[PDB]
Structure formats: structure tokens, C-alpha cells
Design a protein around this ligand. Sequence first.
Ligand SMILES: O=C(O)[C@H]1C[C@@H](O)[C@@H](O)[C@@H]([C@H](O)CO)O1
Lengths: 58, 58
Amino acid sequence: TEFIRFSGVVNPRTISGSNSVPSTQVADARIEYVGNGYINEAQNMGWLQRFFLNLSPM
Amino acid sequence: FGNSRADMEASGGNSFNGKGGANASNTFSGTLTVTVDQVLANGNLHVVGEKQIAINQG
Ligand SMILES: O=C(O)[C@H]1C[C@@H](O)[C@@H](O)[C@@H]([C@H](O)CO)O1
């Protein structure tokens, strides 16, 4: 599953025509596009590799 | 000058070369909607804004 969530503050004067406003005109833009399942799990580093990345010298 | 008493031969050289340089460039091509923080005495507005984006894995 994919979750696309948006949050922000919109001035009720930049809304143009068909109730549409570009995200660049929204203050406090919070945009999340996350996924689940093994497809998302395959994009995680892995505990040992993450530890080496954060601690291993060079 | 009967012998090599006056016979003379000499050479000398002195070469020096120094160089130096430095560069610094930066670019930014975004658009961000900010919010007023306070109104100054002269009418200038203190604007602060923030936007968080979670594409995936970070
Ligand atoms: O007239 C001199 O004073 C010289 C003539 C060269 O021969 C010179 O080299 C020296 C030599 O050392 C004598 O042994 O003598």
C-alpha cells in the first residue's frame, strides 16, 4: 500500500478556478509519500549495514 | 695566462614559481511559502517558513 498525505495552511485567495492551488503556495507544507509491504522493506538498509554506515570509520 | 690560471667557467640559476587559487559557488532554485513572524517598526515583515517532504526512506 502507498500513502500520500498532505498538510498545510492555504490562503483562501490563491485558490484559482476549479478549487485548485499549487503546493508551492501552501504554507507549512508537509508532504509524505510512504509505502508498505516487501517492496518497501527491500528499500531499507538493514540493521548491520546501517550500523556500519553510522559507525564504521570511513 | 700561461697555465689555466685565468681560465674561468661558472654557471648559476634560480627559478621560483608560486600559484594560488580559490573558488566558491552555490545555487538554489526552489519556491517556498512562508508566514509572517512579526511586523517591524518600519513596516518590514519578519517571515519564517518550513516545508517537510518524505519521498521515501527519509
Ligand atoms: O713560477 C712559479 O712560481 C711556478 C710556475 C708553476 O710551475 C707553478 O705551478 C709553481 C709550481 O707549483 C712550482 O712547483 O711554480
